[PDB]
Amino acid sequence: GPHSLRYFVTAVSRPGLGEPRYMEVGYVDDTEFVRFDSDAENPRYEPRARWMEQEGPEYWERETQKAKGNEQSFRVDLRTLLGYYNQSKGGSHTIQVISGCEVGSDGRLLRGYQQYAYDGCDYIALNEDLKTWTAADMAALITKHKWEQAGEAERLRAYLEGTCVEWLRRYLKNGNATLLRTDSPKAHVTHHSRPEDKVTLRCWALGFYPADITLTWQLNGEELIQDMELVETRPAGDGTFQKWASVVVPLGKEQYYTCHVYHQGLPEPLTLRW
């Protein structure tokens, strides 16, 4: 199916405590594969997935230099925004960027993106057309005008359609044993008593990959997506994910509720009851 390459970038100032902290984290689909942290003893771009051992030393040197360049340049951005927003030089501020591309099963571009935020709010973003930008406020409108006059959209478009897609294809090829695998969910249901003759039924889905999955509770073939509680799918520390969904049912009537699990690793969705 489709696959993605995403870089989560963060620059955070800290007046009086030295230079801004700069971090870059890259993912291929739901798998962390590279990282750069300016606060590390000796900041270097580092592999975060075993298959990245397939890249030679040139790659690491180049990505490390590129990261340090981006770091220094973001230091300028933080100062620039203080001017745009007329803010004090003593407060901590944050710049966030999500950059990347998505390809289909055939390796062709499905979409590209690049979005910035300042202190947790939308700042500027490249539109789906990969030709124009959308600015959230007047400060971002200044950036938009600068980028238009610099032909930034064209440069970014060349990166998204070329460089980005090409490396993603290569990463998927090199780490195919990890990235193209499917780990089937293992499910179970737990029971907890509640006051007023009510019971909490919790359906757990463990050890699966990729992260996308559907968990639902049913009663008489009807989905109770409404009175259902749950957590966002989450990483389990070993490259897999887990999730749970619960529903409150009347004591004594637990056998009428069934948990349903749908996942790429389940040729037949799972159906469980307590």
Binding site: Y7, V9, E24, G26, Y59, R62, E63, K66, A67, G69, N70, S73, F74, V76, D77, T80, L81, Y84, I95, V97, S99, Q114, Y116, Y123, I124, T143, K146, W147, A150, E152, R155, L156, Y159, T163, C164, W167
Partner: peptide, 8 residues
């Protein structure tokens, strides 16, 4: 690989 970002 990451792109080289432009200034705001």
């Amino acid at each position: 690989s990451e792109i080289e970002f432009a200034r705001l």
